[PDB]
Write an enzyme that holds these catalytic residues in place. Structure first.
Site, PDB file in Angstrom:
ATOM      1  N   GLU A  35     -12.172  -3.794 -10.671  1.00  0.00           N
ATOM      2  CA  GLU A  35     -11.212  -3.609  -9.562  1.00  0.00           C
ATOM      3  C   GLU A  35     -11.954  -3.609  -8.219  1.00  0.00           C
ATOM      4  O   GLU A  35     -11.507  -4.278  -7.278  1.00  0.00           O
ATOM      5  CB  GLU A  35     -10.398  -2.325  -9.760  1.00  0.00           C
ATOM      6  CG  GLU A  35      -9.231  -2.460 -10.733  1.00  0.00           C
ATOM      7  CD  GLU A  35      -8.278  -3.598 -10.400  1.00  0.00           C
ATOM      8  OE1 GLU A  35      -8.300  -4.039  -9.246  1.00  0.00           O
ATOM      9  OE2 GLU A  35      -7.537  -4.062 -11.304  1.00  0.00           O
ATOM     10  N   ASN A  46      -2.959  -8.199   0.684  1.00  0.00           N
ATOM     11  CA  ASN A  46      -2.199  -9.322   0.090  1.00  0.00           C
ATOM     12  C   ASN A  46      -1.374  -9.943   1.212  1.00  0.00           C
ATOM     13  O   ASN A  46      -1.278  -9.350   2.301  1.00  0.00           O
ATOM     14  CB  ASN A  46      -1.340  -8.869  -1.091  1.00  0.00           C
ATOM     15  CG  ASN A  46      -2.114  -8.086  -2.128  1.00  0.00           C
ATOM     16  OD1 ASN A  46      -1.707  -6.988  -2.508  1.00  0.00           O
ATOM     17  ND2 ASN A  46      -3.231  -8.637  -2.574  1.00  0.00           N
ATOM     18  N   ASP A  48       1.845 -10.512   1.093  1.00  0.00           N
ATOM     19  CA  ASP A  48       3.183  -9.877   1.144  1.00  0.00           C
ATOM     20  C   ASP A  48       3.158  -8.679   2.101  1.00  0.00           C
ATOM     21  O   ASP A  48       4.219  -8.057   2.299  1.00  0.00           O
ATOM     22  CB  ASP A  48       3.657  -9.491  -0.259  1.00  0.00           C
ATOM     23  CG  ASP A  48       2.718  -8.557  -0.999  1.00  0.00           C
ATOM     24  OD1 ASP A  48       1.658  -8.247  -0.446  1.00  0.00           O
ATOM     25  OD2 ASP A  48       3.066  -8.143  -2.109  1.00  0.00           O
ATOM     26  N   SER A  50       1.392  -5.926   1.552  1.00  0.00           N
ATOM     27  CA  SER A  50       0.783  -4.827   0.766  1.00  0.00           C
ATOM     28  C   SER A  50      -0.742  -4.951   0.812  1.00  0.00           C
ATOM     29  O   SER A  50      -1.277  -6.013   1.182  1.00  0.00           O
ATOM     30  CB  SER A  50       1.330  -4.786  -0.635  1.00  0.00           C
ATOM     31  OG  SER A  50       0.901  -5.899  -1.388  1.00  0.00           O
ATOM     32  N   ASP A  52      -4.376  -3.207  -1.327  1.00  0.00           N
ATOM     33  CA  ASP A  52      -4.965  -2.459  -2.459  1.00  0.00           C
ATOM     34  C   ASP A  52      -6.091  -1.580  -1.929  1.00  0.00           C
ATOM     35  O   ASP A  52      -6.898  -2.064  -1.104  1.00  0.00           O
ATOM     36  CB  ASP A  52      -5.484  -3.387  -3.559  1.00  0.00           C
ATOM     37  CG  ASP A  52      -4.432  -4.302  -4.188  1.00  0.00           C
ATOM     38  OD1 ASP A  52      -3.261  -3.888  -4.264  1.00  0.00           O
ATOM     39  OD2 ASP A  52      -4.787  -5.416  -4.617  1.00  0.00           O
ATOM     40  N   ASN A  59      -2.068  -0.188  -5.052  1.00  0.00           N
ATOM     41  CA  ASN A  59      -1.283  -1.053  -4.152  1.00  0.00           C
ATOM     42  C   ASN A  59      -0.314  -0.200  -3.339  1.00  0.00           C
ATOM     43  O   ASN A  59       0.408   0.636  -3.928  1.00  0.00           O
ATOM     44  CB  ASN A  59      -0.545  -2.133  -4.937  1.00  0.00           C
ATOM     45  CG  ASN A  59      -0.018  -3.234  -4.040  1.00  0.00           C
ATOM     46  OD1 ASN A  59       1.176  -3.556  -4.064  1.00  0.00           O
ATOM     47  ND2 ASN A  59      -0.892  -3.807  -3.227  1.00  0.00           N
ATOM     48  N   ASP A 101       3.362   5.327 -17.134  1.00  0.00           N
ATOM     49  CA  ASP A 101       4.667   4.701 -16.816  1.00  0.00           C
ATOM     50  C   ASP A 101       5.071   3.707 -17.905  1.00  0.00           C
ATOM     51  O   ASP A 101       6.169   3.130 -17.780  1.00  0.00           O
ATOM     52  CB  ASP A 101       4.678   4.115 -15.401  1.00  0.00           C
ATOM     53  CG  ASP A 101       5.297   5.043 -14.367  1.00  0.00           C
ATOM     54  OD1 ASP A 101       5.384   6.256 -14.652  1.00  0.00           O
ATOM     55  OD2 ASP A 101       5.718   4.545 -13.285  1.00  0.00           O
TER      56      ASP A 101
END
Ligand SMILES: [Cl-]
Ligand SMILES: [Cl-]
Ligand SMILES: [Cl-]
Ligand SMILES: [Cl-]
Ligand SMILES: [Cl-]
Ligand SMILES: [Cl-]
Ligand SMILES: [Cl-]
Ligand SMILES: [Cl-]
Ligand SMILES: [Cl-]
Ligand SMILES: [Cl-]
Ligand SMILES: [Cl-]
Length: 129
Positions: A35, A46, A48, A50, A52, A59, A101
């Protein structure tokens, strides 16, 4: 801060990531490795809008608030800057929420593609925590 492999393993074990939701300690070290390369300051914007953040590249669309992501939820209830700390507590606590999750660690694509189904115990080997 760039954690060494063994130094990071001991922090994650000390933070109770070992066999957390069935994911052994190597999985977490391996995920951090691909990562961020063990770098708590690692960032990755990113297109969009967003970004990280930190050692597990969490994110800002779902998990933390950077307040400049049109997404956006803050499901770990933290600022994204808390995830850039040399203390890994906030990254680890947010990771525990994600991994709970039902996607599990598949949330982390680097782990899916680089770690999953491999001998992940290799990552904690030669540390002895
Ligand atoms: Cl558990
Ligand atoms: Cl392991
Ligand atoms: Cl390496
Ligand atoms: Cl940013
Ligand atoms: Cl992180
Ligand atoms: Cl919005
Ligand atoms: Cl969102
Ligand atoms: Cl917050
Ligand atoms: Cl926290
Ligand atoms: Cl899995
Ligand atoms: Cl080895």
């Amino acid at each position: 801060k760039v954690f060494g492999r063994c130094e990071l393993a001991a922090a994650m074990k000390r933070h109770g990531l070992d066999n957390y939701r069935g994911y052994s300690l190597g999985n977490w070290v391996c995920a951090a490795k691909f990562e961020s390369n063990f770098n708590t300051q690692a960032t990755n914007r990113n297109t969009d809008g967003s970004t990280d953040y930190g050692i597990l590249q969490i994110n800002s669309r779902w998990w933390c608030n950077d307040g400049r992501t049109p997404g956006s939820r803050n499901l770990c209830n933290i600022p994204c800057s808390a995830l850039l700390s040399s203390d890994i507590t906030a990254s680890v606590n947010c990771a525990k929420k994600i991994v709970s999750d039902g996607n599990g660690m598949n949330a982390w694509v680097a782990w899916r593609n680089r770690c999953k189904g491999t001998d992940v115990q290799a990552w904690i080997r030669g540390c002895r925590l």
